[PDB]
C-alpha cells in the first residue's frame, strides 16, 4: 500500500511473474523509474526519450512504455517526510511492478549507511548483480583486440566479505572474537593476534545456488555458449571452493548437466534452442589473465561478490567502458536496472555528463523484457554515435577529431543512428 | 650452526645484519642457493654464470660471489635421508646467510603444509612477497603500450584469508562459530545461516606496518617516484581500511611524510635524492583499471595478500611476462629469491625452459645487496637478447622471425650483450 504519491498510468498495465519466473510482458507495461539525484535530472529524461525512440522504431506504436515515476533519495525527502529517504511506497511500487530503472542516488548524511543502493538491495533482497561488458566501435581501448570481450558477469551481492561483519583492531569486540577463535576453535595460522582487525566471509548454499540458478537460466534464455564459475577455491576450500561445488550441483540438478568426458567441467544442451552450453570453472587470479589473453573463450560468468567486483571493473577498463557501465540488481523476480556512476552534483542540470550508462542499462531492461529488437536498436544507435565520434565530454577527451555533444544531444545522436 | 652435508666456501665471507636494519655486504659474499626440483637443473647453472658475468663485468674483479649449495626438495632426499624433503640444516644456512636464491619446488600436496615453499615462508617468517614487473622490448603483449608498466608489487603473504582459517559448511564447527557469531556477537548481516562456510580475514597492525615499512624503504633505497597503498577499504574499514591508515602512519613515523595539496595522499623525501616522493592510495578494484589506463603513474605498490595476488597476475599478463616473472620472499632480514613458475616435470633436464624468471629474480638479489650496477647489467642483457630476437621456445613460438635458443645458450646470449 501507500498509493498516495504514485500516479499510476491509466493506459498502463502490469508486468507479471509466473512459474519458472518467466515473464509475461504486455505491450503497454508500466515501468517505475527513479530520476536519481544530482545529474539524474539530465540522464533519465534522455534515457526515457532514447528508449521511447527505440521501442517506437522496432514495433511502430504496437508497444509503448507507461513511464511511472517513483521517488527515492533526496527527491523522496522533498516529496515524503525528511526522514523517508527511502519510502515504503517506492518499494511496493518496484515489487508490484517487476521491472524498473533508476539513476544515481545521494547518500543520506551520516547514519548507519554509506549508500542508498545498498538499502534497496537489503530491503528487496537483491542478490544478483548483472553487469554486461562489451566493446563499442570507436571507443578508445588500451588493448589490441577489445572486440573479443562479450561477457555477462553474474555477481552475488548478499554474501561474502562485503556483508560488513567486521570488528576494529584493538577493540574489545575483536578480542572476544579472536580469543574465542584461538581458545575454543583451536584457530592457528594467524600470525599476529594483537591489534588485529577481523572480518567474516560467509558463503551459503542458498545464496550460492540462487545466483548460479539465475546465471544458468540467462544462458538459456539468451542462447549463450558457456557459464564459468570463477573462484579462488584452491586456497579457500569451504567458501569459494564450496561456491564452485554448489554451482556445479545446480547445473547437474536443475538443468541436466552431465560430466564432459570426465569433468571437471560439465555441459548441457539448451532446452529451447538445442545449442551446447558449457559449465566450466576458472581460478579467480587466473581469470584476470584470461580476460586479457583469451577473452573470446568466455561468455557468462558466475562468481562471488569480491571476485565479480574486481573482474567487472577490469573488463570495463579493458573495453574503455568504465563511464558507460550498464548494471542490474535482481531478486527472485524484482529486477532493478541502474547507472553505475555517482551523482556528480557539480554538473547537475547542466546537460553535460554521459547518459550512456543509464541508456545501456535500459538496453538490459528491454533485453530482459523480451523486447530484443528494441534493445538491438539501442546497441546500433550506440555504435553509430560513437563511431561517428559525436560523444559527450568524457569520450571527447580521449578521441582525436571528435565532436563535443551535450547529454541530450548525444541521445538524439543515438536516435538518429538506430 | 649446522655443518653435515654443506660445504662452506673457503674464499667466502658472511653477510650480517646490524642496527638501522642495514645490510652489510662484503667484497666476497656467501649466497646459499637451492637448485630446485624438475627444471631446476636447467636454470640454476645458467643463472650462476650470468650473475658471475654481471658481478665481474660490472665490478672489475672487485666483487665475486661464493656460491654455497644448500639442499631442499627431491635432491635433499637423496643427499640426506629419503624422508627429509626439507633439512633443518638448510634453514640454518638461509637464516645465517640472509640472502639466498631458489629454484622451483613441487607444490600440490594439501597437508597442513600445502607446499614446500609455504614451509619455507612459514618457518622463516617470510612476510613480504616482492614481484617487480616491466616490459622487455619485443615481447608479445595484449596491450597497446606495454612499456608503460614499470612497477614493484609488495604483497603481504603471512596474513589475510590466505592464512587458511576456514570451516566447512554444514559442519559442527561452522554451526559453532555461527551460533557464536549470531547469538553472542549480535551478527544479523548474514543472509543464510544454514549450510554456510565461514572464513576469517585477519589484518593486523604489525603485519601491515612491516610490509609497508619494507615497501617504503625499497622506495628510498632504489629512488622510486611513489608508493601506492592498494586497499579495498571503502567497504572493509577495519581490515583493508585499517591497512590503509596503518600504511599512512608508517610514512609519518619512520619516513617523515606530510600531507600535500589538502590530502588525502602524502609526500616525504628520500635522504638519497631529495626528489619529492609520493605516498598515495587507490581502491583495489579501481587499481585493476588504473594499471590498464594510467600504469605510468605507479611505481612501488604495497598491498594485502589477496589484492597483491590478483594485482601481480594482471600485470604479468599485461606485459606478456607470465613465464618470466621474478619473485622474492623477504623477512625483517632473511631474503630468499626464487623462480615463480612451476617445476615443469615433463621438461626436466632437457635444457628448454626459459631461465628469465630465475635470472631476473637474481637481478633483485643484486639490487637488494646494493650492487645496483651488476643488477642493471642483467636488465641491459635481458632487453638486448629479447630485442635481438634470441629467445627460448616459449617466446619463439609467439614471435615472427624469431631465433630458437636453448636455456643455456640464452644465458650466454645475455652475457654477450651486457
Curated annotation (Swiss-Prot), chains A, B:
Manganese found in the keyword field: yes
Enzyme class per UniProt: oxidoreductase
Keyword annotations from UniProtKB, A to Z: Glyoxylate bypass, Magnesium, Manganese, Metal-binding, NADP, Oxidoreductase, Phosphoprotein, Secreted, Tricarboxylic acid cycle
Keyword Magnesium: yes
InterPro entries, sorted: IsoCit/isopropylmalate_DH_CS (IPR019818), Isocitrate_DH_NADP_dimer_prok (IPR004439), IsoPropMal-DH-like_dom (IPR024084)
Cofactor(s) listed in the protein's UniProt record: Mg(2+); Mn(2+)
EC annotation from Swiss-Prot or TrEMBL: 1.1.1.42
Amino acids binding D-threo-isocitrate: 115, 117, 121, 131, 155
Entry binding sites for Mg(2+): 309
PROSITE patterns attached to this UniProt entry: IDH_IMDH
Modified residues (Phosphothreonine): 193
Catalytic activity: D-threo-isocitrate + NADP(+) = 2-oxoglutarate + CO2 + NADPH
Xref: PANTHER family: ISOCITRATE DEHYDROGENASE [NADP] (PTHR43504:SF1)
Name under which the protein is recorded: Isocitrate dehydrogenase [NADP]
Organism: Pseudomonas aeruginosa (strain UCBPP-PA14)
Gene this protein is translated from: icd
Amino acid at each position: 500500500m501507500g498509493y498516495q504519491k504514485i500516479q499510476v498510468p491509466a493506459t498502463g498495465d502490469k508486468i507479471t511473474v509466473n512459474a519458472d519466473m518467466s515473464l509475461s510482458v504486455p505491450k503497454n507495461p508500466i515501468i517505475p523509474f527513479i530520476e536519481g539525484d544530482g545529474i539524474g535530472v539530465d540522464i533519465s529524461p534522455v534515457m526515457i526519450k532514447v528508449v521511447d525512440a527505440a521501442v517506437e522504431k522496432a514495433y511502430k506504436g504496437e508497444r509503448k512504455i507507461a513511464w511511472m515515476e517513483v521517488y527515492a533519495g533526496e527527491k523522496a525527502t522533498q516529496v515524503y517526510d525528511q526522514d523517508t529517504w527511502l519510502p515504503q511506497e517506492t518499494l511496493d511500487a518496484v515489487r508490484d511492478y517487476v521491472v524498473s530503472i533508476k539513476g544515481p542516488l545521494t547518500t543520506p548524511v551520516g547514519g548507519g549507511i554509506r549508500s542508498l543502493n545498498v538499502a534497496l538491495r537489503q530491503q528487496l533482497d537483491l542478490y544478483v548483480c548483472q553487469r554486461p561488458v562489451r566493446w563499442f566501435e570507436g571507443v578508445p581501448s588500451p588493448v589490441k583486440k577489445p572486440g573479443d570481450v562479450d561477457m555477462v558477469i553474474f555477481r552475488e551481492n548478499s554474501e561474502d566479505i562485503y556483508a560488513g561483519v567486521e570488528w576494529k583492531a584493538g577493540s574489545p569486540e575483536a578480542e572476544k572474537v579472536i580469543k574465542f577463535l584461538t581458545e575454543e576453535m583451536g584457530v592457528k595460522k594467524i600470525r599476529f593476534t594483537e591489534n588485529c582487525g577481523i572480518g567474516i566471509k560467509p558463503v551459503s548454499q542458498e545464496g550460492t545456488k540462487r545466483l548460479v540458478r539465475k546465471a544458468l537460466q540467462y544462458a538459456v534464455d539468451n542462447d549463450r555458449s558457456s557459464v564459468t564459475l570463477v573462484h579462488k577455491g584452491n586456497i579457500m576450500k569451504f567458501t569459494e571452493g564450496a561456491f564452485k561445488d554448489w554451482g556445479y550441483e545446480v547445473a547437474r540438478d536443475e538443468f541436466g548437466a552431465e560430466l564432459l568426458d570426465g569433468g571437471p567441467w560439465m555441459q548441457f544442451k539448451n532446452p529451447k534452442t538445442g545449442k551446447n552450453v558449457v559449465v566450466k570453472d576458472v581460478i579467480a587470479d587466473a581469470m584476470l589473465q584470461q580476460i586479457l589473453l583469451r577473452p573470446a573463450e568466455y561468455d557468462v560468468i558466475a562468481t562471488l561478490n569480491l571476485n565479480g567486483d574486481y573482474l567487472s571493473d577490469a573488463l570495463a577498463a579493458e573495453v574503455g567502458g568504465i563511464g558507460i557501465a550498464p548494471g542490474a540488481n535482481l531478486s527472485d523476480s524484482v529486477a532493478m536496472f541502474e547507472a553505475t556512476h555517482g551523482t556528480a552534483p557539480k554538473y547537475a542540470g547542466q546537460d553535460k555528463v554521459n547518459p550512456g550508462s543509464l541508456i545501456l542499462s535500459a538496453e538490459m531492461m528491454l533485453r530482459h523484457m523480451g523486447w530484443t529488437e528494441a534493445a538491438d536498436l539501442i546497441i546500433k544507435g550506440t555504435n553509430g554515435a560513437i563511431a561517428a565520434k559525436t560523444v559527450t565530454y568524457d569520450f571527447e577527451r580521449l578521441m582525436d577529431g571528435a565532436t563535443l555533444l551535450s547529454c541530450s544531444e548525444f541521445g538524439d545522436a543515438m536516435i538518429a543512428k538506430m
